[PDB]
RNA sequence: GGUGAAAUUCUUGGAUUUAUGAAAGACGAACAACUGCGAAAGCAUUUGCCAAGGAUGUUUUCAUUAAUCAAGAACGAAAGUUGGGGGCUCGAAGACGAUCAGAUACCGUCCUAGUCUCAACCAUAAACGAUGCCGACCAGGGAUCGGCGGAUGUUGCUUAGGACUCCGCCGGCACCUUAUGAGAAAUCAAAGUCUUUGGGUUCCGGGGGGAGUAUGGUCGCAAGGCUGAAACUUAAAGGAAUUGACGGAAGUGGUGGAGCGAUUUGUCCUUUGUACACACCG
């Protein structure tokens, strides 16, 4: 179930069952490292570094080649970024969502989700402090 | 008390064939009274069959606003047009979808007119789905190429020619053809004309149509 | 139909490929990645059948595939092998 | 007697309690 | 003058309790004749009867006859707007009294007022209680 | 005891209904609970139809038609026979009038 | 004009009716559905902008971050309150006209607050699916909506694609049949998987009244909301279903079968409602 709705919607992406690299894949493990650092390099973040490595290049996954996650990679190399993806981007539409209602007062339905966006945001920020993911004072306001 | 009002035939413009409207009647000419203030401004509903003496046009009025008088005879210009009741309640139905548009358009003789539009989703020969619904996206596309396409017509040209559109309702058919793409359309019409300015009345203009 | 008709272990593979993706014994992807051909231009350039990107042939030609709600439409004059 | 106007006769018996015993 | 036929447009107000026959020119600009249900019956419980509806019809013949009027435009309307959108009984006595009285009948529209939406009607949420 | 599965309304998945003013009496009834009827009438008793399409300046003309959808309370539905009180197993039939 | 019939009321100082035009304020018909969207309340004229959302697809990403929740919050029909604007229609209260044995009602007329909007409150509904939420399993079937995949052969169509057609998958509002189930039954495909009793969690009931009353507390301008007794009283109250009787509602065994059963079928006045069973003279 959605955590804050009554969708029951059960879409999402199978990874095959061989784990091993497709035969048709030849490029080396070296070259999809270095591709992902120039792709965090100018600001990508690891699901569009996936997605492009994905529907751009002959990379179907790229646990499969290197071994590693990207994320893992990229923290190997330096290139994570501070905060989370995932709470960035829920930061993100939060302060759309507050920057819509500062314009538009009578909006309670925004209002509400509002309310709903910032409690995703309290629990993803209580669990990267739990894993030390996030500064120990790191606080959203 | 009808013995001092005295009967003004009244005559179509030529764009219909038939100019013999009726005979309408005003009191006789008096102080300040003349019988032009009695015909000035009137409308007359009148059928379109009537005047191109074609009965599948029945469904369809016309109106005409006297503005001059010459003579006995009073002459009329096209004032906006509009379905009969019967023809709109007879293609309003269930289990389909009804588009309707409006939209603003000028003549080159500043001629402001608000043209309604009417559209049904059309059932296939081989269709098993006992109705036939478009989507609010379909029919805001419809509802787009209906309205740009009235923008097109009567911008362009003049009441006139738009009127001789109007007739054998050719904008109508364009409709049709323009929406295929997008979903099979049935009874579409331009159901309503209405003139919401005229320019300032030219006696030289009124005469060239009649 | 009835499972008393069939084995749960070996299930007649006819019928396996029509289940949702997840609903299988084990579960995989019906997505695949393809060899497409362009008009006269070698440019291989393998792409997802799923791509959620407009995938642009590298001599910054035509684009070669649309992303849709499914399968990426190929551009008009295009052909593809499985991979 | 209608649960309604049963609900009806005492709020307004209790308005008459309220104005008398605070007032 | 010497038409084919001159017509006239015949405003039949069929209410629930009245009926109306108003003619009219081609503009409705310049009254004719107006005959009324009850300017011809003197109970209001027969008004909107078709009798009424008949006398009414009869007498508007003659004066159409009289006007030198021999066809007729019908434009029949309920009450209309919130209230209620049916004919009353008169409608169909006024206009077969008019066709069997030797006038002719050009067309025949409904003409009664339908809103768009509407004002609220009177008669209270549970309606008229009886 | 409920007597009916769908509470003698049609409403399913959603919560409000505009309600609608009864034709007869001007009640306030929900639309999907309404007694809903599609009268295609003619404008001209069928006794008068001979007379009137005699007295017609034109020999073609189709004598217009009325169509009218008229709502109605359960009350003045009842009343006036648009529907009438069935018997238990007949209740469950929403067929239209074979 | 209005009604069953009238009357109150308007009207030769033009009522009602007809045509044209303007202004105002509401209201968004038909389409319109055992259809959609939304946490609920609720949401139906166009277009544009703003942010948000479900489902589907995915060989994208994180990797347990989850479920339900005292505390604490957000929203919350209608009516109602304070002030501004608006005030068409309708319309509590009020006045009048009827009806009436009476008629402070039902019916009719005129209408105040209100109905509309802004700011601030109020937090209640038969706010209902009278069914809390999450999860697993367990019948069949055909429709329908959204997305996706496949196969089609016709398009006033602009090869794809749209529109129809057919087959699937996921998700949604529902519907039909059936018991192998459950149930007091009505009925329910969940209200099933329960004495063969245990997936997780919140709220909440313990005969009927007194009583959602008193009092205290708290919130609210108020109206009231939330929390919430006792004394005392009572042998039933209540639910579902059956037969009969009634309606100012419509038009006799046997054996076998069904039902836990009263009963029923057979017997094709019937159906229907019932709080009546001394049976409506209730
Ligand atoms: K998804
Ligand atoms: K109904
Ligand atoms: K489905
Ligand atoms: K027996
Ligand atoms: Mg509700
Ligand atoms: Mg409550
Ligand atoms: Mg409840
Ligand atoms: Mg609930
Ligand atoms: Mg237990
Ligand atoms: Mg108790
Ligand atoms: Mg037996
Ligand atoms: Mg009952
Ligand atoms: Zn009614």
């Known amino acids: ?141 | 008390p009808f013995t001092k009002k005295q009967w003004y035939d009244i005559k179509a413009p030529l764009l219909f064939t038939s100019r013999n409207v009726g005979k309408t009647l005003v009191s006789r000419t008096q102080g300040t009274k003349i019988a032009s203030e009695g015909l000035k401004h009137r409308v007359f509903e009148v059928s379109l069959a009537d005047l191109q003496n074609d009965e599948d046009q029945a469904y369809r009025k016309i109106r005409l606003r006297a503005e001059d008088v010459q003579g006995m005879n009073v002459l009329t210009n096209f004032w906006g047009m509009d379905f009969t009741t019967d023809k709109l309640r007879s293609l309003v139905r269930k289990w389909q979808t009804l588009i309707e548009a409006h939209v603003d358009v000028k003549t080159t003789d500043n001629y402001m007119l608000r043209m309604f539009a009417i559209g049904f989703t059309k059932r296939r020969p081989n269709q098993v789905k006992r109705t036939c619904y478009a989507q609010a996206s379909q029919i805001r596309q419809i509802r787009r190429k209906m309205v740009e396409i009235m923008v097109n017509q009567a911008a362009s040209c003049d009441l006139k020619e738009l009127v001789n559109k109007f007739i054998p309702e050719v904008i109508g058919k364009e409709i049709e053809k323009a929406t295929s793409s997008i979903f099979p359309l049935q009874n579409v019409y331009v159901r309503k004309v209405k003139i919401l300015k005229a320019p300032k009345f030219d006696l030289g203009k009124l005469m060239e149509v009649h | ?83 | ?23 | ?130 | 005891t409920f007597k009916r599965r769908n509470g003698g309304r049609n409403k399913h998945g959603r919560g409000h209904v505009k309600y609608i003013r009864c034709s007869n009496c001007a009640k306030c009834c929900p639309k999907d609970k309404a007694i809903k009827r599609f009268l295609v009438r003619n404008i001209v008793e069928q006794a008068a139809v001979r007379d009137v399409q005699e007295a017609c300046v034109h020999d073609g003309y189709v004598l217009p038609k009325l169509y009218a959808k008229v709502h109605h309370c359960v009350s003045c539905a009842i009343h006036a026979h648009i529907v009438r009180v069935r018997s238990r197993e007949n209740r469950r039939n929403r067929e239209p009038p074979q």
């Open chain 5, 1 to 130: 003058r010497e038409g084919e036929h001159v017509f006239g447009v015949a405003h039949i107000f069929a209410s629930f309790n009245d009926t109306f026959i108003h003619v009219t020119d081609l503009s409705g600009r310049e009254t004719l004749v107006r005959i009324t249900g009850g300017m011809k019956v003197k109970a209001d419980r027969d008004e909107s009867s078709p009798y009424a509806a008949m006398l009414a019809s009869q007498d508007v013949a003659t004066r159409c006859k009289e006007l030198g009027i021999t066809a007729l435009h019908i434009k029949l309307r309920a009450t209309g707007g919130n209230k209620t959108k049916t004919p009353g009984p008169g409608a169909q006595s006024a206009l077969r009294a008019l066709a069997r009285s030797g006038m002719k009948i050009g067309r025949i529209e409904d003409v009664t007022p339908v809103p768009t939406x509407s004002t609220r009607r009177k008669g209270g949420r549970r309606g008229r209680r009886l």
């Open chain 1, 1 to 141: 179930g959605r955590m804050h709705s009554r969708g029951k919607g059960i879409s999402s992406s199978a990874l095959p069952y061989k784990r091993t690299p497709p035969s048709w894949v030849k490029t080396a493990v070296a070259d999809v490292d270095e591709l992902i650092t120039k792709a965090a390099k100018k600001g990508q973040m690891p699901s569009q570094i996936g997605v492009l490595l994905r529907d751009q290049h002959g990379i179907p996954l790229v646990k499969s080649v290197t071994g590693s996650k990207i994320l893992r990679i990229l923290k190997a190399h330096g290139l994570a970024p501070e905060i989370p993806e995932d709470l960035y981007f829920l930061i993100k539409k939060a302060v759309a969502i507050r920057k819509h209602l500062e314009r538009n007062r009578k909006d309670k339905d925004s209002k509400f989700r509002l309310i709903l966006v910032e409690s995703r945001i309290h629990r993803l920020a209580r669990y990267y402090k739990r894993t030390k993911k996030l500064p120990p004072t790191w606080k959203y306001e």
């Open chain 3, 1 to 83: 139909v009835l499972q008393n008709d069939i084995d749960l272990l070996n299930p007649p593979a006819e019928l396996e490929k029509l289940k949702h993706k997840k609903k299988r014994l084990v579960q995989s992807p019906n997505s695949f990645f393809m060899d497409v051909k362009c008009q006269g231009c070698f440019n291989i350039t393998t792409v997802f059948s799923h791509s959620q990107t407009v995938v642009v042939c590298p001599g910054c030609q035509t684009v070669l595939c649309q992303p849709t709600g499914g399968k990426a439409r190929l551009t008009e004059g295009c052909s593809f092998r499985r991979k």
């Open chain 4, 1 to 23: 007697m209608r649960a309604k106007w049963k609900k009806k006769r005492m709020r307004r018996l209790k308005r008459k309690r309220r104005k008398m015993r605070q007032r």
